[PDB]
Amino acid sequence: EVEAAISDVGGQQIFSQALLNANRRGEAKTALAEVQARHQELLKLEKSMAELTQ
Amino acid sequence: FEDLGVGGLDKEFTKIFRRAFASRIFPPSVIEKLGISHVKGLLLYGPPGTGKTLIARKIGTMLNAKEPKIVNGPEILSKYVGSSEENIRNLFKDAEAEYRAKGEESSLHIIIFDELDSVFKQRGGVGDNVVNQLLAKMDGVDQLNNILVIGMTNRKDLIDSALLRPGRFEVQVEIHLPDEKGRLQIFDIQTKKMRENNMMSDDVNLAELAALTKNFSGAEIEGLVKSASSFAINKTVDIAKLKVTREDFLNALNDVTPAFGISEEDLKTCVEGGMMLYSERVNSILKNGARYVRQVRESDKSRLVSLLIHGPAGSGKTALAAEIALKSGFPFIRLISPNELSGMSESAKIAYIDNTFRDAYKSPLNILVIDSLETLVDWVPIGPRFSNNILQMLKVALKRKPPQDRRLLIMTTTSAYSVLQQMDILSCFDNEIAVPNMTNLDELNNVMIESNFLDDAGRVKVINELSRSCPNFNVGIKKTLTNIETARHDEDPVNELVELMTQSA
Amino acid sequence: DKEFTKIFRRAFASRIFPPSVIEKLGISHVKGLLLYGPPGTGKTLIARKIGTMLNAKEPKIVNGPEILSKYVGSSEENIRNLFKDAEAEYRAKGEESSLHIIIFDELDSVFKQGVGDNVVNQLLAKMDGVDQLNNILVIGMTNRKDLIDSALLRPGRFEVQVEIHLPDEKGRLQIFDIQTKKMRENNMMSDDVNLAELAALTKNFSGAEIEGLVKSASSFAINKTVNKDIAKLKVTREDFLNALNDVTPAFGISEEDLKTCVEGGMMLYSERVNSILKNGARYVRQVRESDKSRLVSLLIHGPAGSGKTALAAEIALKSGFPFIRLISPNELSGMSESAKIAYIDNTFRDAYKSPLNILVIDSLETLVDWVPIGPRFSNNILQMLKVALKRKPPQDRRLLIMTTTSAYSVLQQMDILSCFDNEIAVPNMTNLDELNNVMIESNFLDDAGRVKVINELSRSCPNFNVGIKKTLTNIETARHDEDPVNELVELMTQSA
Amino acid sequence: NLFKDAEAEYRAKGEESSLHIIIFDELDSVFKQRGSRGDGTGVGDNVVNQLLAKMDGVDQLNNILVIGMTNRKDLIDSALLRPGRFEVQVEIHLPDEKGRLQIFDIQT
Amino acid sequence: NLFKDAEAEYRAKGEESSLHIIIFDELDSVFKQRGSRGDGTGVGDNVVNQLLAKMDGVDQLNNILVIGMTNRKDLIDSALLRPGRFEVQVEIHLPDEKGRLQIFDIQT
């Protein structure tokens, strides 16, 4: 007559992935992309003070 | 008690008030000086649709508790591991919080479970975890005595043994169907908006209405009244005097079908072909049935009777049972036949039958009919084969006396007597009625005049031909009626009716 | 139109009355309506049109999957944002507030049995309980009714259920005309195209795939053109007829097999055939005429190969009733037991839904799975049939059932013979004249051959006794080997 | 971002627009049936919804043919398989003997 | 996470640490005989075995007291009742008469 055939229900697991804040944007965001123009200024101090020391 | 909207339930409120609230009413100085905790659980049980939700709700308002938090049984389950039980845990959070914060001056909380037996079966799968989770928290290591939990169920005899111990579910209460006084009070409460606002005529006497309605469940009375009012207003469409008179009430009363009442429709269908007394036996049979009905109604000790009717196939057995039933006037009537049960699974059939048995014990007065036995038992002679379990269900059922003063008559029918003795079941039955088929010509005469088969010439000639031809006439009524119709709608009565009728006997 | 009157009379009556009596009495308005049916029926049309017809507010159309929101928790904010206007209008006026209708395309999409759960909680919270908003009416619809969460399925919520339907002749014809308008005006259909017969072709089709058909026939016309004759572009029936092969429906029809069961044709080789046919005609008349005989059962039995199914099918086809179907073992192959029982049950339920009906069951033993060794057989199916055959249909409805069999003695053994009203026997032919009739009807040999066959058989085989099937196949096989008698007579002789 | 160019050009020029074609090789990667569960981060839903918005309510963009290549039809949302969206489905099965000969011809 | 505070004190103040007490209520729901039931996903074994490893592992503790309460002694896993883990087992059973008298005394 009868027996077993399909059984369980209460039993499962799940992993979990993750995205990230957008503002993050490219690494260049404050104190990163400005270092290009901040360097020309610093080269200006170096120079103007080279005039100073000479 | 009755100042609030609940009629007929009197003892229950005395008991509940005495046991539950007599320790929350007095000033805490006293009861603290007394040193007793509070009851922390309640189980009230009964048939559906009796007003259990209502009583549960009103209790909270009486105590000025917080708004009730509600949940229903089967929804608790989820299909992930341990969230089915997380939900059970969530419910007590706010009570915990307010207890820790305030202390002993916190305001009482209320929780309502619905259909408790749907999950909380005896333990020993998810089920054990659920039962466990509720136990460990209902009364745990940390004290929490500002809460109250209410339980609602139909089957008390299936809940796990541990929840019913003094400490978790102390007070057990039963809710039964309304009595006559209950019905009268129910009408009084329900028809208050109509009464003061003056849209009920003065002719309607609700006491008569109460008397007329028996085994009405207490919810459906609302259905009746709203239907009647809707009927009246729809009939109107004028704003002279919108009055509801008795005719609306009678109409709506006629329309509605209670759940615990007569199932007229299938019985009328059962006897569709009519009852004509073509011979002398019929009278006697019906007299027997009436006698037994009286014996059931009047006695005290014979609270149950089992009565069997049997005879040859096609003898028209079931119709007599339906007739006897319909001429009795009892409030509760149901019919079990193979027709309903067709297509179901085995477990389904046993469940159905057993439900149908248990319901009757509630009502004061009941008759219950079984259409055929070998068919239900799945008999087939080669081997032979049949289902043992259903047989045992029936065998056990036919001895169970009603649990209380309620009363029951059981009627059953079969055509296979011999098999039943070879089964060793015959001891179930106290008394027997026999239904043989016709063996005479004058009986043919009576039936054919009643059917008005043809004019007298045809009638006389056919009885003469069968007199001279068939000496030992013997058939049941089924073939007689169907053959008569066949001859009628066919040609030349001698050509077929006589020939068929010989070929059948 | 019947739904058009049910919903009007039953549901939508309370709002008509002066609002004062409704507030005073306490009567509560019907709230929820579920339209359900297969895709493509145009349900959104009726849903909009009910609102427009009843002079209701302008609906909010919301898609099913669109309820699922990007942000966690914002779906529920949307659900609560939707009702603000109706709730505020109710606050301002109350009993005089206008009727607000909300239409939910693909309700099942999100309200399945954790955003999709909070939305359930959230709707359920506002829709009943603290609120008594009898102006927020809802009209949901779903193609798949089973996925609805049980939490919502209770009285007072979605109380009225409405069935949708599929195209009729004049409706499909009118939509055909509607689509063809622009082309028929501009003289670019060949006049030979008759629209009505195209409707007669398209039986299980709905408008969008009608457009598919039109575009396809056009595309074939294009194919004819491309390997400056644009003036000759005219869509001809052969484009449309050829295009019929590409598109496909999602329906099924079974009438065809009750037509293929008589593929071999009738030959009327003997008189008893005619007698039987007359009897069947008599019985169908009997059913049609008498108001009391609402259930008639016949049994047809005979030796294997005598020919039993074709006869019943012939009776049924000459009957001409609205509803005819067939149960044969062929359809039931490959399933498990619990599935055969359900299939049979469904078919029986489907036959109670028309004033006059005919039903035919084939070769009972195979349905019961009889084998004589044990003997073994499946009892449950047997008892299913036993109870089914004796059920009087609901009021005013009438059936006529014919069942064919070939093992009468076994049938006698199970004691089921009580279920039938009248029996018919079908013996196979035994006389050589009948062979001659069949033979001339088979026009396989010339006159001389058709005489020599009977001459040879008369002197070899007095008792003929073979089923017609064997005769037909024997003729067929003999036509290739040796057309002369010197094959067929012998082959029949081993078949004698 | 893919649809911008053709959109702009079309919007400007009307119907003269040159026909633009886009082909998704290996479509079944991400367009699994949106009415699904597993309840991770819902990006796998948003994506398909986006395409559908740009594909059905095109707002009169009639110069686009999107071609999908797959090995297994079944995986895909039925909500892409409907009129107005992926109408024609072409099955390409094993070659015959004559085609076998042409394949030799071309390879050799 | 139940043990962190305990170990933390042990490492710093070696012997003098105060006693930490942790109470398990209903031990018999999660810690069954490992391997018998059909786990399906394989969670229960992990719970049991994690507890085994921590209770008396390669790193010694001398601070902790753990309590367990249950109705069905027999179902608990076999290895946990080894002395050194759950050493002393006590039976609570229905009181006789003198017990009942004492209960009445101390209640009222």
Ligand SMILES: Nc1ncnc2c1ncn2[C@@H]1O[C@H](COP(=O)(O)OP(=O)(O)OP(=O)(O)O)[C@@H](O)[C@H]1O
């Ligand atoms: N006095 C009567 N004698 C015989 N038949 C009657 C009588 N009164 C009514 N009937 C008809 O008998 C039928 C109902 O009886 P029923 O069909 O149950 O007979 P049965 O022998 O129990 O059936 P079955 O042969 O299936 O066991 C109806 O047609 C009913 O009208």
Ligand SMILES: Nc1ncnc2c1ncn2[C@@H]1O[C@H](COP(=O)(O)OP(=O)(O)OP(=O)(O)O)[C@@H](O)[C@H]1O
């Ligand atoms: N005179 C005839 N009567 C009936 N059928 C005929 C006749 N001549 C030819 N045939 C053909 O016989 C074919 C097969 O008949 P049918 O399917 O009834 O066989 P059957 O004897 O029922 O088979 P089985 O032994 O499996 O039950 C039909 O398609 C029909 O056209």
Ligand SMILES: Nc1ncnc2c1ncn2[C@@H]1O[C@H](COP(=O)(O)OP(=O)(O)O)[C@@H](O)[C@H]1O
């Ligand atoms: N004894 C009663 N008195 C007044 N109303 C009742 C009574 N019993 C049921 N009702 C009505 O039925 C509804 C309550 O349903 P209830 O019967 O409590 O649900 P269930 O019994 O199915 O849990 C309310 O409208 C209530 O007024």
